[PDB]
Amino acid sequence: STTANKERCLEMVAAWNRWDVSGVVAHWAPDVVHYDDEDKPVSAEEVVRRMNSAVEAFPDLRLDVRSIVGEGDRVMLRITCSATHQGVFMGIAPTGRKVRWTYLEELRFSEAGKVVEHWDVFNFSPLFRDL
Amino acid sequence: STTANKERCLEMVAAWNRWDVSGVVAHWAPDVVHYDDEDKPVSAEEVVRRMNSAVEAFPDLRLDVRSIVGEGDRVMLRITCSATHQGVFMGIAPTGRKVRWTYLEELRFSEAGKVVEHWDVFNFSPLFRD
Numbered sequence A: 001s002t003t004a005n006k007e008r009c010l011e012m013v014a015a016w017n018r019w020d021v022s023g024v025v026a027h028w029a030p031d032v033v034h035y036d037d038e039d040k041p042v043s044a045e046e047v048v049r050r051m052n053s054a055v056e057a058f059p060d061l062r063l064d065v066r067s068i069v070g071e072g073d074r075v076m077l078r079i080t081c082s083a084t085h086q087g088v089f090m091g092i093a094p095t096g097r098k099v100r101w102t103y104l105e106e107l108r109f110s111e112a113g114k115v116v117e118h119w120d121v122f123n124f125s126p127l128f129r130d131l
Numbered sequence B: 001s002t003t004a005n006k007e008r009c010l011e012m013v014a015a016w017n018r019w020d021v022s023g024v025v026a027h028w029a030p031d032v033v034h035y036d037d038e039d040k041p042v043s044a045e046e047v048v049r050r051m052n053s054a055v056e057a058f059p060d061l062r063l064d065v066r067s068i069v070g071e072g073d074r075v076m077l078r079i080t081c082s083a084t085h086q087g088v089f090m091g092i093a094p095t096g097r098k099v100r101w102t103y104l105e106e107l108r109f110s111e112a113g114k115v116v117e118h119w120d121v122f123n124f125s126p127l128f129r130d
Protein backbone atom coordinates (compact mmCIF):
# COMPACT_ATOMS: atom_id res chain seq x y z
CA SER A 1 0.00 0.00 0.00
CA THR A 2 2.55 2.53 1.13
CA THR A 3 5.02 0.80 -1.18
CA ALA A 4 2.62 0.93 -4.10
CA ASN A 5 1.78 4.55 -3.51
CA LYS A 6 5.44 5.47 -3.51
CA GLU A 7 6.03 3.66 -6.78
CA ARG A 8 3.10 5.52 -8.26
CA CYS A 9 4.73 8.78 -7.24
CA LEU A 10 8.00 7.80 -8.89
CA GLU A 11 6.10 7.01 -12.07
CA MET A 12 4.72 10.56 -12.01
CA VAL A 13 8.18 11.91 -11.57
CA ALA A 14 9.37 9.80 -14.49
CA ALA A 15 6.55 11.19 -16.58
CA TRP A 16 7.58 14.75 -15.79
CA ASN A 17 11.16 13.73 -16.65
CA ARG A 18 10.12 12.70 -20.18
CA TRP A 19 8.03 15.85 -20.35
CA ASP A 20 4.76 13.96 -20.57
CA VAL A 21 2.03 15.72 -18.53
CA SER A 22 -0.52 13.17 -19.54
CA GLY A 23 1.50 10.50 -17.80
CA VAL A 24 1.23 12.44 -14.55
CA VAL A 25 -2.55 13.02 -14.88
CA ALA A 26 -3.10 9.32 -15.51
CA HIS A 27 -2.72 8.68 -11.80
CA TRP A 28 -5.45 11.12 -10.76
CA ALA A 29 -8.79 10.04 -9.38
CA PRO A 30 -11.81 11.34 -11.23
CA ASP A 31 -12.70 13.46 -8.17
CA VAL A 32 -9.16 14.73 -7.47
CA VAL A 33 -8.72 18.02 -5.66
CA HIS A 34 -5.57 20.13 -5.99
CA TYR A 35 -4.95 22.86 -3.42
CA ASP A 36 -2.95 26.01 -4.10
CA ASP A 37 -0.65 27.86 -1.72
CA GLU A 38 -3.64 29.40 0.03
CA ASP A 39 -5.34 26.03 0.35
CA LYS A 40 -7.87 26.94 -2.28
CA PRO A 41 -8.81 24.23 -4.79
CA VAL A 42 -7.51 24.72 -8.35
CA SER A 43 -9.56 23.17 -11.14
CA ALA A 44 -8.13 20.19 -13.04
CA GLU A 45 -8.26 22.32 -16.17
CA GLU A 46 -6.15 24.99 -14.63
CA VAL A 47 -3.75 22.55 -12.97
CA VAL A 48 -3.08 20.94 -16.32
CA ARG A 49 -2.67 24.33 -17.92
CA ARG A 50 0.00 25.24 -15.37
CA MET A 51 1.79 21.94 -15.87
CA ASN A 52 1.79 22.35 -19.62
CA SER A 53 3.13 25.91 -19.23
CA ALA A 54 5.98 24.70 -17.03
CA VAL A 55 7.10 22.10 -19.59
CA GLU A 56 6.89 24.83 -22.22
CA ALA A 57 8.98 27.20 -20.18
CA PHE A 58 11.47 24.57 -18.97
CA PRO A 59 11.55 21.94 -21.65
CA ASP A 60 14.79 20.36 -20.47
CA LEU A 61 13.65 20.08 -16.85
CA ARG A 62 14.85 17.31 -14.62
CA LEU A 63 13.41 16.39 -11.27
CA ASP A 64 15.59 14.83 -8.61
CA VAL A 65 13.73 13.16 -5.81
CA ARG A 66 15.74 14.16 -2.75
CA SER A 67 13.59 12.28 -0.29
CA ILE A 68 10.34 10.35 -0.36
CA VAL A 69 8.33 9.14 2.62
CA GLY A 70 5.06 7.20 2.76
CA GLU A 71 2.72 6.32 5.57
CA GLY A 72 -0.88 5.22 5.32
CA ASP A 73 -2.59 6.82 2.35
CA ARG A 74 -0.02 9.66 1.95
CA VAL A 75 3.31 10.23 0.34
CA MET A 76 5.50 13.32 0.58
CA LEU A 77 8.43 14.06 -1.65
CA ARG A 78 11.13 16.70 -1.52
CA ILE A 79 12.17 17.41 -5.10
CA THR A 80 14.74 19.59 -6.78
CA CYS A 81 14.06 20.70 -10.31
CA SER A 82 16.85 21.86 -12.65
CA ALA A 83 16.22 23.44 -16.03
CA THR A 84 16.98 26.22 -18.48
CA HIS A 85 14.55 29.03 -18.90
CA GLN A 86 13.72 28.77 -22.58
CA GLY A 87 10.12 29.97 -22.59
CA VAL A 88 7.89 32.65 -21.20
CA PHE A 89 7.20 32.01 -17.61
CA MET A 90 4.68 33.39 -15.20
CA GLY A 91 5.06 36.37 -17.41
CA ILE A 92 8.86 36.59 -17.33
CA ALA A 93 10.17 36.11 -20.84
CA PRO A 94 13.04 33.72 -21.54
CA THR A 95 16.63 34.34 -20.37
CA GLY A 96 18.27 31.14 -21.44
CA ARG A 97 19.54 30.90 -17.89
CA LYS A 98 20.09 27.79 -15.84
CA VAL A 99 17.58 27.69 -12.96
CA ARG A 100 16.81 25.51 -10.05
CA TRP A 101 14.06 25.28 -7.41
CA THR A 102 13.01 22.96 -4.66
CA TYR A 103 9.58 21.86 -3.58
CA LEU A 104 7.38 19.54 -1.60
CA GLU A 105 4.75 17.43 -3.31
CA GLU A 106 2.17 15.73 -1.11
CA LEU A 107 -0.30 13.19 -2.37
CA ARG A 108 -3.14 11.31 -0.77
CA PHE A 109 -4.32 8.14 -2.48
CA SER A 110 -7.63 6.21 -2.60
CA GLU A 111 -7.70 2.55 -1.72
CA ALA A 112 -7.58 1.84 -5.45
CA GLY A 113 -4.31 3.79 -5.90
CA LYS A 114 -5.45 7.02 -7.48
CA VAL A 115 -4.59 10.53 -6.33
CA VAL A 116 -7.56 12.11 -4.55
CA GLU A 117 -5.93 15.14 -2.94
CA HIS A 118 -2.70 16.96 -3.82
CA TRP A 119 -0.75 19.74 -2.12
CA ASP A 120 2.61 21.34 -2.65
CA VAL A 121 5.01 23.95 -1.32
CA PHE A 122 7.23 25.70 -3.82
CA ASN A 123 10.26 27.77 -3.03
CA PHE A 124 10.53 29.83 -6.12
CA SER A 125 12.92 32.30 -4.37
CA PRO A 126 16.03 31.05 -6.15
CA LEU A 127 14.13 31.34 -9.39
CA PHE A 128 12.79 34.89 -8.82
CA ARG A 129 16.13 36.14 -7.58
CA ASP A 130 17.82 34.64 -10.57
CA LEU A 131 15.26 36.00 -12.99
CA SER B 1 10.82 4.18 16.18
CA THR B 2 8.85 6.28 13.72
CA THR B 3 6.01 6.72 16.17
CA ALA B 4 8.52 8.03 18.65
CA ASN B 5 10.17 10.29 16.04
CA LYS B 6 6.87 11.76 15.09
CA GLU B 7 6.06 12.65 18.71
CA ARG B 8 9.39 14.31 18.99
CA CYS B 9 8.48 16.43 16.00
CA LEU B 10 5.18 17.34 17.63
CA GLU B 11 7.21 18.37 20.71
CA MET B 12 9.21 20.71 18.56
CA VAL B 13 6.02 22.26 17.18
CA ALA B 14 4.68 22.72 20.72
CA ALA B 15 7.91 24.45 21.70
CA TRP B 16 7.55 26.85 18.77
CA ASN B 17 3.95 27.54 19.77
CA ARG B 18 5.06 28.69 23.24
CA TRP B 19 7.83 30.63 21.56
CA ASP B 20 10.60 28.53 23.17
CA VAL B 21 13.44 28.03 20.58
CA SER B 22 15.49 26.27 23.16
CA GLY B 23 12.86 23.54 23.29
CA VAL B 24 13.35 23.04 19.57
CA VAL B 25 17.16 22.99 19.81
CA ALA B 26 16.99 20.43 22.57
CA HIS B 27 16.18 17.78 20.03
CA TRP B 28 19.29 18.34 17.95
CA ALA B 29 22.18 15.91 17.96
CA PRO B 30 25.50 17.46 18.89
CA ASP B 31 26.66 16.94 15.30
CA VAL B 32 23.46 18.02 13.50
CA VAL B 33 23.61 19.33 9.97
CA HIS B 34 21.14 21.90 8.67
CA TYR B 35 20.83 22.68 5.00
CA ASP B 36 19.91 25.99 3.56
CA ASP B 37 17.81 26.67 0.55
CA GLU B 38 20.69 25.68 -1.82
CA ASP B 39 21.69 22.54 -0.01
CA LYS B 40 24.68 24.04 1.72
CA PRO B 41 25.18 23.37 5.42
CA VAL B 42 24.26 26.21 7.80
CA SER B 43 25.80 26.43 11.22
CA ALA B 44 23.70 25.44 14.19
CA GLU B 45 24.49 28.86 15.62
CA GLU B 46 23.18 30.67 12.58
CA VAL B 47 20.01 28.53 12.54
CA VAL B 48 19.45 29.46 16.20
CA ARG B 49 19.86 33.07 15.29
CA ARG B 50 17.29 32.93 12.56
CA MET B 51 14.86 31.10 14.81
CA ASN B 52 15.29 33.67 17.58
CA SER B 53 14.66 36.48 15.17
CA ALA B 54 11.41 34.88 14.00
CA VAL B 55 10.10 34.59 17.55
CA GLU B 56 10.86 38.26 18.03
CA ALA B 57 9.46 39.36 14.72
CA PHE B 58 6.32 37.16 14.75
CA PRO B 59 5.69 37.00 18.47
CA ASP B 60 2.17 35.62 18.25
CA LEU B 61 3.04 32.96 15.75
CA ARG B 62 1.03 29.75 15.65
CA LEU B 63 1.94 26.58 13.79
CA ASP B 64 -0.66 24.08 12.74
CA VAL B 65 0.57 20.73 11.51
CA ARG B 66 -1.34 20.06 8.30
CA SER B 67 0.12 16.58 7.78
CA ILE B 68 2.91 14.47 9.15
CA VAL B 69 4.42 11.28 7.73
CA GLY B 70 7.09 9.08 9.23
CA GLU B 71 9.00 6.28 7.57
CA GLY B 72 12.25 4.73 8.78
CA ASP B 73 14.49 7.36 10.24
CA ARG B 74 12.68 10.30 8.61
CA VAL B 75 9.76 12.58 9.27
CA MET B 76 8.19 15.11 6.95
CA LEU B 77 5.66 17.68 8.11
CA ARG B 78 3.68 20.29 6.18
CA ILE B 79 3.04 23.13 8.54
CA THR B 80 1.19 26.41 8.33
CA CYS B 81 2.37 29.41 10.33
CA SER B 82 0.05 32.32 11.02
CA ALA B 83 1.25 35.44 12.80
CA THR B 84 1.36 39.18 12.87
CA HIS B 85 4.46 40.76 11.46
CA GLN B 86 5.60 42.96 14.35
CA GLY B 87 9.38 42.97 14.13
CA VAL B 88 12.15 43.24 11.52
CA PHE B 89 12.87 39.84 9.94
CA MET B 90 15.72 39.25 7.42
CA GLY B 91 15.81 42.87 6.62
CA ILE B 92 12.11 43.08 6.14
CA ALA B 93 10.49 45.75 8.24
CA PRO B 94 7.27 45.05 10.12
CA THR B 95 4.01 45.79 8.40
CA GLY B 96 1.87 45.06 11.41
CA ARG B 97 -0.32 42.84 9.24
CA LYS B 98 -1.47 39.27 9.47
CA VAL B 99 0.82 36.94 7.52
CA ARG B 100 0.55 33.27 6.81
CA TRP B 101 2.83 30.77 5.08
CA THR B 102 3.00 27.00 4.62
CA TYR B 103 6.18 24.95 4.60
CA LEU B 104 7.90 21.61 4.77
CA GLU B 105 10.14 20.43 7.53
CA GLU B 106 12.09 17.23 6.97
CA LEU B 107 13.98 15.68 9.85
CA ARG B 108 16.33 12.67 9.95
CA PHE B 109 16.85 11.02 13.34
CA SER B 110 19.63 9.01 14.87
CA GLU B 111 18.77 5.67 16.45
CA ALA B 112 18.63 7.38 19.84
CA GLY B 113 16.05 9.85 18.50
CA LYS B 114 18.07 13.03 18.07
CA VAL B 115 17.91 15.14 14.93
CA VAL B 116 21.02 14.56 12.75
CA GLU B 117 19.97 16.19 9.50
CA HIS B 118 17.40 18.84 8.77
CA TRP B 119 15.93 20.33 5.60
CA ASP B 120 13.14 22.91 5.02
CA VAL B 121 11.17 24.12 2.00
CA PHE B 122 9.57 27.55 2.42
CA ASN B 123 7.26 29.66 0.27
CA PHE B 124 7.96 33.00 1.93
CA SER B 125 6.30 34.97 -0.83
CA PRO B 126 3.64 36.35 1.53
CA LEU B 127 6.43 38.25 3.25
CA PHE B 128 7.59 39.92 0.04
CA ARG B 129 5.06 39.51 -2.65
CA ASP B 130 4.61 43.32 -2.78
Ligand SMILES: COC(=O)[C@@H]1c2cc3c(c(O)c2[C@@H](O[C@@H]2O[C@@H](C)[C@H](O)[C@@](C)(O)[C@H]2OC)C[C@]1(C)O)C(=O)c1c(O)cccc1C3=O
Binding pocket: B012, B013, B016, B024, B034, B035, B036, B037, B042, B047, B050, B051, B054, B055, B061, B063, B081, B090, B105, B118, B120, B122
Ligand atom coordinates in the same frame (compact mmCIF):
# COMPACT_ATOMS: atom_id res chain seq x y z
C1 LIG C 1 7.98 29.46 12.72
O1 LIG C 1 9.27 29.50 12.13
C2 LIG C 1 9.29 29.37 10.77
O2 LIG C 1 8.26 29.39 10.06
C3 LIG C 1 10.58 29.26 10.20
C4 LIG C 1 11.34 28.15 10.70
C5 LIG C 1 10.73 27.00 11.17
C6 LIG C 1 11.44 25.91 11.66
C7 LIG C 1 12.82 25.97 11.69
C8 LIG C 1 13.45 27.10 11.18
O3 LIG C 1 14.79 27.14 11.21
C9 LIG C 1 12.78 28.20 10.69
C10 LIG C 1 13.51 29.31 10.18
O4 LIG C 1 14.20 28.88 8.97
C11 LIG C 1 15.53 29.31 8.86
O5 LIG C 1 15.67 30.67 8.57
C12 LIG C 1 15.17 31.12 7.40
C13 LIG C 1 15.40 32.65 7.24
C14 LIG C 1 15.92 30.44 6.30
O6 LIG C 1 15.35 30.89 5.05
C15 LIG C 1 15.80 29.00 6.43
C16 LIG C 1 14.44 28.48 6.06
O7 LIG C 1 16.71 28.44 5.47
C17 LIG C 1 16.17 28.53 7.76
O8 LIG C 1 17.54 28.81 7.90
C18 LIG C 1 18.13 27.63 8.38
C19 LIG C 1 12.73 30.53 9.79
C20 LIG C 1 11.36 30.60 10.52
C21 LIG C 1 10.58 31.86 10.12
O9 LIG C 1 11.59 30.68 11.98
C22 LIG C 1 13.56 24.92 12.21
O10 LIG C 1 14.82 24.97 12.22
C23 LIG C 1 12.93 23.82 12.68
C24 LIG C 1 13.66 22.76 13.19
O11 LIG C 1 14.98 22.92 13.22
C25 LIG C 1 13.07 21.63 13.69
C26 LIG C 1 11.68 21.55 13.65
C27 LIG C 1 10.91 22.59 13.18
C28 LIG C 1 11.54 23.73 12.67
C29 LIG C 1 10.78 24.78 12.15
O12 LIG C 1 9.53 24.70 12.12
